[PDB]
Every structure is written in C-alpha cells, then in structure tokens.
Amino acid sequence: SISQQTVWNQMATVRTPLNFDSSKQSFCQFSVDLLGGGISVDKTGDWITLVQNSPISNLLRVAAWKKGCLMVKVVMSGNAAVKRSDWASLVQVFLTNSNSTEHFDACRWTKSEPHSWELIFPIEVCGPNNGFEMWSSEWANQTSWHLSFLVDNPKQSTTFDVLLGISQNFEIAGNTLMPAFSVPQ
C-alpha cells in the first residue's frame, strides 16, 4: 500500500464574483462536479474559477470506471476586512449525484463561521458495472457526485478551495480520451 500522511491534492479554487451586485440578489451559486472535474457558476457576475491539474484531478478526469472512497475537504477563506461583529453571511452546501433538481440531496450542510471554516467528508463511488461507475454514462443511467454551494453574501464568504484525498481502496479501470489540460502559463 502506498501512503503518506497529510498529503491531499488540490482540485478547485472558486473565487466569488468581484462585481457581484447585492442590489439585484443577495446570494450567488456555483457547483463542482467532483468526478467529472467541472465547475458551474451563476450569471451573477464574473467568477474566477480554477481546476488545478493536480495528480488526482488529472486521474479522475481520465479514469473511465471508478469505484471506492475519496475524502473531500472544503476550505472557505473569507474577507478578513469585515470585523467579526459584522459577519452576516452563511453558505449552504449540498451533495447530489446530479445537477437536475428532480434529484434529492444525499447530504446537506450550512456553515456560517466568521472569516473561515473547513468541511471534511467522504464520498464513495458505487456503480452498476462491477461496483464500478462511469461518469454520467447514459448506460445504466449512471451518475456522478456534485458539490453545490449557495453563498449568501459573496462579499464576506469570498473564497473556496476543494481538496480531494484518495482512499486505500479507490480502484479504476479503462481510459477516457480527453483533450489537453491547460496549464496556466
């Protein structure tokens, strides 16, 4: 077994739109497709999003059949300029296998600590093939795992980092042909 302590992999960094307009609406929304490797955002402003080409981020996007556990860690780094007494923001997190609203939530959290918080939880991939699941395959009407955020007051809860940790039992099979991954610079 290969292993090392405290070594996770960066997957995404989502920065709230800088030009968010409180006047039109109070919150904003984004969603990270954990297994597919994509980030979806609001038309609420100009989001700054990034999927790091870390080893796990690369592996997941290219692994056709997946199976097993993964560890998820979300770190929210907010606006340090707000005095603690003025904190008036909260973010709701949802775990769903699909982005369709016809699907109920696998889990749900609401975090409101001032300036920063952290959220760690495991996800497990179970599919029809041999316990193996292919990302959103039309085949057995397969699915994925999406982590969605509803950020109430994007100016305080400004930044989100998503890290993934691979488990001792994660197992994959087959290769998905993908176009080249862009390297910033």
């Binding site: 070594v7 960066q10 080409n53 080893p55 996007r61 059949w65 197992e171 290769n175 080249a180 390297v183």
Partner: protein, 351 residues
C-alpha cells in the same frame, strides 16, 4: 472463425498520408456494425458476450517503403479528445509497419471491469476506436492503398484489468509512449535522452496530455522497477541503423567517448523484423527516483535517470529518409513506489 465473424471495415490509406493523420476515429460499435456476416445478428440480439473482440487487419507493401499505423481502443471519450499516439495507446493499442507485418491481429476486452460486454454497452458507454498513421510513407506508393479489417467474436474469454491506485499489481501495465526517435542518415551519433521521471503526463503547448495508467503512476512520489520497453521500426526496412540503448544521467556530453562502457543494448533490425523488446532491470538503478521533476529542470540539474539512445555506427540507405523508431514503456515489473505526490504543474514534451 467464419461463423464468429461479425463485421468488416475498409480503412483508406492515401498515398500521400503523413503521420499524425487520423485514418478513422469512430465509436467501436460502428466498426462492429459494417456488413452482414455470420455472427452479425447474434452480436445484436445477445445481451451478454464473453468472448473477446478479435480483429485481423491486412495490407502488404513492398520493402522499399514503410509506414507505421496504430489501431487504438479506449473505454470512452469526452469532447474533442486528443488523437496523439501518446494519449490513445494506453488501454489496448497495436502499432504495426505493413512493410514488415502484412497481417496484424489484436484481441481485447471492451469492459475492463468485468468479463462480458454488449453491443448496447458499447454504444451507450462510448467505447472508442482510433486508427491513425503514426509515421507517413518512407516512399509513396504508386496508387492509394486500403487496409481491410475483419472483426470476430473470439472464443477467448474476457478478463478484467483494473487498477488499485494505492496498491499496484505486479506487473504494472503502463503503456506509456516515450517518443518517436528519428536518426537522420549520416555518421552522426544523434544522442537521444528520454527522461524516466514519466509522471505528470506528456507535455503539449501550455497543456498536458494524459492517459489513465500514466495518471495512476503520477499519484506516487518515488518509484523503481524493472522497465520493459518495446521498440518499433516505423520506417522502411531499407534504411539501416544500429541503435545503442543504455541508462545514464542527463549531464553527460553527447561526445562522451565511453558511453558504451555502461551496460547497453545494441539493436539492428532484420529486413522483415519490426519489434524488439528491451528490458532494463533494477540493477541499473541505485534507488527510486522522482515520479515528476519540474519541467523547467535542466539536463545538468536532473537527478533522475534517463533512457539514452544513440547511433552505434551510422544511419545509411540508398533511398531518402531518416531512420525512425518508436519507444513504448509497456510494463514495470517488481515495481516499488514511495509516498504520495502533491503534484508539480506541467510536464516536458516527448519525442
């Protein structure tokens, strides 16, 4: 066979094909659905099939020309996926030179997770097939050529091939393309240096190419193993050249006289011979080395070993063209890896 024949595809090979050229890229299900042969409606009216898919490709060309074709199978595809030999060859892919091999065979299991497949499964899953020309014609034919592929359901049962990321099997099947090496005609040494810090994928322009088995190796921090390389002659059998292979560090000068004082392997191909399998055991490596080195790293500062390739005598022919060979690291035996890799951004370009 005849009765288990399910389809037949005819791939066009223009006399002016160049290399990097995609002859045909489609859904495997579509190649398996051309023509009405003995087992055709069976392929379509059967819910589970345990035999592997077998294909037989034929086309012969004279010895004074050459061309390298590759036929690659991949579980799925998303978007405008890369068709580079590196990206497409990690699952089930055979590379051949019709000047040496006039009929090529390949059997594979379309469902690596289990032991059976379906035609529906192939369609809804997106199983892909790319037939590309890796190296163009050494000398162009008189007319346009055509490759005929016969498809069969084999009697050979399907066997799974899965990867446990933090628990590699032995041997570890990597199938990583190391590059396409060209040795121009002349008395030049043409020293080639392929780094063994193969993690992180293949470099592209402000991008990286990636395939699954290479992605799992990139998960580990350090590694060692007996490396097995498969060397293929991708040019006409008329361009002769003796290539010398050995392990050494990046900092040696091209003109190092006693390069061959190191343990090495001399390779000369016979007219009709096209493949050679080199195997470098762990006795060549003192310790494990980095899985990834940062791309900007110089030959002088690289502390990881390299697979060197150079001309032992000379590259000679009576027709024009460079001597070209393709190197593929197929498997790693008795591998040993240490630690988990946080990752380094980007990677160097292959040959």
């Amino acid at each position: 066979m005849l009765d288990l024949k399910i389809s037949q595809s005819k791939i066009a090979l223009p006399k002016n094909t160049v290399g990097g050229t995609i002859l045909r890229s489609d859904l495997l299900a579509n190649f398996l659905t051309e023509g009405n042969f003995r087992a055709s409606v069976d392929l379509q009216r059967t819910h589970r099939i345990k035999g592997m898919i077998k294909m037989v490709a034929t086309v012969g060309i004279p010895e004074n020309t050459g061309i390298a074709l590759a036929c690659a199978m991949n579980s799925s595809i998303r978007g405008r996926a890369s068709s580079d030999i590196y990206t497409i060859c990690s699952q089930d892919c055979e590379l051949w030179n019709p000047a040496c091999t006039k009929a090529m065979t390949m059997s594979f299991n379309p469902n690596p997770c289990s032991d059976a497949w379906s035609l529906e499964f192939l369609k809804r899953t997106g199983f892909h097939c790319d037939i590309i020309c890796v190296t163009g014609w050494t000398a162009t034919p008189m007319q346009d050529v055509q490759v005929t592929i016969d498809w069969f359901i084999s009697s050979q049962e399907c066997v799974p091939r899965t990867y446990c990321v933090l628990n590699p099997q032995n041997p570890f099947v990597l199938n990583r393309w190391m590059g396409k090496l060209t040795f121009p005609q002349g008395t030049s040494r043409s020293v080639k240096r392929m780094p063994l810090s193969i993690g992180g994928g293949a470099g592209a322009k402000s991008a990286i190419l990636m395939n699954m088995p290479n992605a799992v190796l990139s998960m580990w921090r350090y590694f060692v193993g007996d490396l097995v390389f498969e060397v293929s002659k991708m040019t006409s059998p008329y361009i002769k050249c003796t290539v010398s292979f050995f392990i050494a560090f990046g900092n040696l000068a091209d003109d190092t006289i006693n390069f061959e004082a190191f343990p090495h392997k001399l390779v000369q191909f016979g007219e009709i011979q096209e493949k050679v399998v080199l195997k470098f055991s762990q006795e060549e490596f003192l310790t494990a080395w980095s899985t990834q080195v940062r791309p900007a790293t110089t030959l002088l500062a690289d502390g990881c070993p390299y697979l060197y390739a150079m001309v032992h005598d000379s590259s000679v022919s009576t027709i024009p063209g460079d001597f070209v060979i393709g190197v593929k690291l197929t498997i790693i035996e008795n591998m040993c890896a240490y630690g988990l890799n946080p990752g380094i951004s980007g990677s160097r370009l292959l040959g």
